[PDB]
Swiss-Prot record, chain A:
GO MF annotation terms: 2-isopropylmalate synthase activity; acetyl-CoA C-acetyltransferase activity; manganese ion binding
Organism placement in taxonomy: Bacteria, Pseudomonadati, Pseudomonadota, Betaproteobacteria, Neisseriales
Organism of this sequence: Neisseria meningitidis serogroup B (strain ATCC BAA-335 / MC58)
Function: Catalyzes the condensation of the acetyl group of acetyl-CoA with 3-methyl-2-oxobutanoate (2-ketoisovalerate) to form 3-carboxy-3-hydroxy-4-methylpentanoate (2-isopropylmalate). Complements an E.coli deletion.
Predominant place of localization: cytoplasm
Family: Belongs to the alpha-IPM synthase/homocitrate synthase family. LeuA type 1 subfamily.
Name of the encoding gene: leuA
Protein name in the entry: 2-isopropylmalate synthase
Reaction(s) this enzyme catalyzes, per UniProt: 3-methyl-2-oxobutanoate + acetyl-CoA + H2O = (2S)-2-isopropylmalate + CoA + H(+)
Record's subunit section: Homodimer. Remains a homodimer in the presence of L-leucine.
Amino acid sequence: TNRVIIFDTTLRDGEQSPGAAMTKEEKIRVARQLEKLGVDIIEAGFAAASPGDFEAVNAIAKTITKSTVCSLSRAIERDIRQAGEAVAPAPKKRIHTFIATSPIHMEYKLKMKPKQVIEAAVKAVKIAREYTDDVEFSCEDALRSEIDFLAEICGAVIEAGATTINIPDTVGYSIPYKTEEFFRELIAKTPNGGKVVWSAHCHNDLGLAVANSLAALKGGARQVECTVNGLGERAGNASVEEIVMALKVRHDLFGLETGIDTTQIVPSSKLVSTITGYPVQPNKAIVGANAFSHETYEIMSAESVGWA
Amino acid sequence: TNRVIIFDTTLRDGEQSPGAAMTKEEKIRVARQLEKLGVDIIEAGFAAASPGDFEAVNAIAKTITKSTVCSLSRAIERDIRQAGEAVAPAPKKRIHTFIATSPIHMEYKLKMKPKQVIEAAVKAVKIAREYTDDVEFSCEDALRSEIDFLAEICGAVIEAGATTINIPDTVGYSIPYKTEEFFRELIAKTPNGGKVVWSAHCHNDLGLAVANSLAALKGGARQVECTVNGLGERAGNASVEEIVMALKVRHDLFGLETGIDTTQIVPSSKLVSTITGYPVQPNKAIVGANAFSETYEIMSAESVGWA
Ligand SMILES: [Mg+2]
Ligand SMILES: [Mg+2]
Ligand SMILES: [Mn+2]
Ligand SMILES: [Mn+2]
């Protein structure tokens, strides 16, 4: 379809930003607001990381109704079961597992051979399916990985039961036309790649996270991972408000739909910025104090994104 | 040519952001830092706007020697002569003049027939050449203009003496693949198009200013208009530091060069931020506080000027 899945990881990937740690009650209040915003998936945390993380994921899984509650997990049985237990009380639940897939990370960081990396991923996915029909797998460091190896592991995890395959720009140096080509080629090479949802998780190190996200869509991805205000380590993630509004404003070029209530964009941005201490600069798209200072496209009004 | 021209308009387009007006002393100091950074053109102001603006532009023109000093002008005789008088002292000097080229702006704002609009542009560009051989013409509202009219007016001002033609995304809703197509088509359609430098001036209203600028270069543009920290009205301009470091890091894909000293990027960011009161967020590419917490060139913090 033309439906783009918005996967928000403000509460997991965003909260990892220096100084951005949140209390359990702050996470719950942010999770409630993301639900009102209409994001499809709320990644609530990494249940196996500590008792506090488990408790926050679990509390969000007990709060949310209309969005899918996700937990991160390493590709290891015990972490998967932690994830599955934490999200069990949510009516819609996802487990997101990952493993590094690039030659150097595999050999010298994980110290596993490619055969072992595929076997661990398949096993993690199969265990995850005991807990939910909705399982995401990420190829960490995808863009420095061998394309043949990516097609093979993605193929294996699709067969094992993964229904969303996520490709991060781990380093953050990709350029949109290359991102688009990379998606088109990987989807084509992966056994049964047409049968699942492809996801992009882009980084803003060269100011291109949003452009690269949109390029991933043109290449065949239908999920974008992103955060309110682009909150995230280093230069940050793709910012959900920019993605959603590029798609809304230029529906004429993309023809893609989201479930987002755009009137909740500004309240979401303010709430996130207040809680985390990360200010939003004045010239920032959509939610910057100046963005509304002042054809087949749909021009945007300040009110349409929730300015008072 | 694989040289990209970095046109900085922090002191003009940037200055126009609410609250960001700068005194002459502030402008001189930013301008010296922009010269150190190695930008090719410093658009210093709009000389005809007031005597204070004339003085500031002229002060910059007496300061800067290694970069081109530019003034904005409307497409009218008074403004062009004042731009030309104010930049006269600089060894490298440019006048940038402009007119709206869209059906709506021409009919409703200008109240001129397209023919009169061309004639006014041609007249402004000829007078500009009395003052310098280096003249930029912008088609204001280019992306809502009829491409055949753009080709005609651009052909006419090139004949008149414009050597840089600038295409702004005035509304700011362009998408990279469309920006690339648009430049490729316009350059090829314009008479003597190959004789001049084509420029992009992109806006960040959808978060896409930098990507649109890179797309313009893929499309044949060789000048990018940009500002320190993306300073400008609304959601701002393409950020000079992002454009320059995207080109540097991914030189493997672009093969394009600038004369920028990248070690000057963070000093320039901090200075502009201090003087304008426009902070940069922690998660801001290159210059944000957290930014630094294979055929490509990995960026070190020290390479962009972090202490
Ligand atoms: Mg906190
Ligand atoms: Mg000031
Ligand atoms: Mn991230
Ligand atoms: Mn501008």
